[model samples]
Target: PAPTPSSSPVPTLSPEQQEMLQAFSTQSGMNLEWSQKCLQDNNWDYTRSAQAFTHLKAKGEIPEVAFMK
Candidate 1:
């Protein structure tokens, strides 16, 4: 996939994307890629995605590898 950032309302998403992934992974202790995937899957809805991650984690539904340190 192309790695270039596209034109949009939000500029400089490189830092923004990393910040989102950092916050999500920091709190949930999930891998960066997994957090990014979850955020994208939820259309970047932070609350919902975070809730889903924690909920699934609590339920023991998330795979062990997803929590890689």
Candidate 2:
């Protein structure tokens, strides 16, 4: 079997994406304080978090953001 190609590159988050991420994190075991601290500890670069979110969205764990809307 061969692999299929994706139509679009993974989208990056904007301010709205941050909002959605905060909401999703709060719904889980992560709290707003912890989320901020974690980001700060990681220099506020949400790459890891975004990657995780992208994976979950791909697996239907969450909704996908169309240009961070």
Candidate 3:
């Protein structure tokens, strides 16, 4: 029997969070295409880019609750 292929886990992101991320990406000089390719190239590690975003938030680089929308 052929070996069964395991499905990759889905990344979780709320709708509002997605919108905030998109806005942040645009403001930070990163387009969706580059971000997507970078994430894919890095094996989709949220910690990598997410930490940067967190730092930006802490430094008042992004608006608070921007993701709430």
Candidate 4:
């Protein structure tokens, strides 16, 4: 008889979050890491993060390092 192995637990993003991540990345011109960070900060809400990004970008509060490499 073959033994069954338990599935390993791992942290992952949801499909919705991934969708938002890509959208935000494209719109904000930020890398994946920064996009995810913004999403997390805004409770994973796409529009909120997008608005925050816009405000921060306009104020130049977000440093150049936050952008894609």
- Which lDDT tens digits does candidate 1 get at residues 1-69? 245665555653355567688788866777777788777767667778877888878684677677873
Model 3 CA RMSD to the hidden true structure, in angstroms: 9.9
- Model 3: CA > 4 A from native: 1-24, 47-69
lDDT of 3 by residue, 1-69 (tens): 335566656865445444444654554454543444334433455446654555555574444334332
List per-candidate RMSD values in Å. Answer: 6.5, 14.9, 9.9, 5.4
lDDT tens digits, residues 1-69, model 2? Answer: 235564555654346546544754543334444444344434455666544544544563442233233
TM-score of each: 0.60, 0.30, 0.30, 0.60
Give Cα distance to truth, residue 50, candidate 4, Å.
1.3
Residue 18 Cα positional deviation in candidate 2, in Å, after optimal superposition: 6.6
User: Residue 8 deviation, candidate 2, in Å?
Assistant: 44
Q: Ten consecutive residues with minimal summed lDDT in candidate 3? A: 60-69
Candidate 3, pairs of clashing residues: none
lDDT of each: 0.72, 0.47, 0.47, 0.74
For model 1, how many clashes? 0
Please give the ranking of all candidate structures by TM-score, highest first, separated by commas.
4, 1, 2, 3
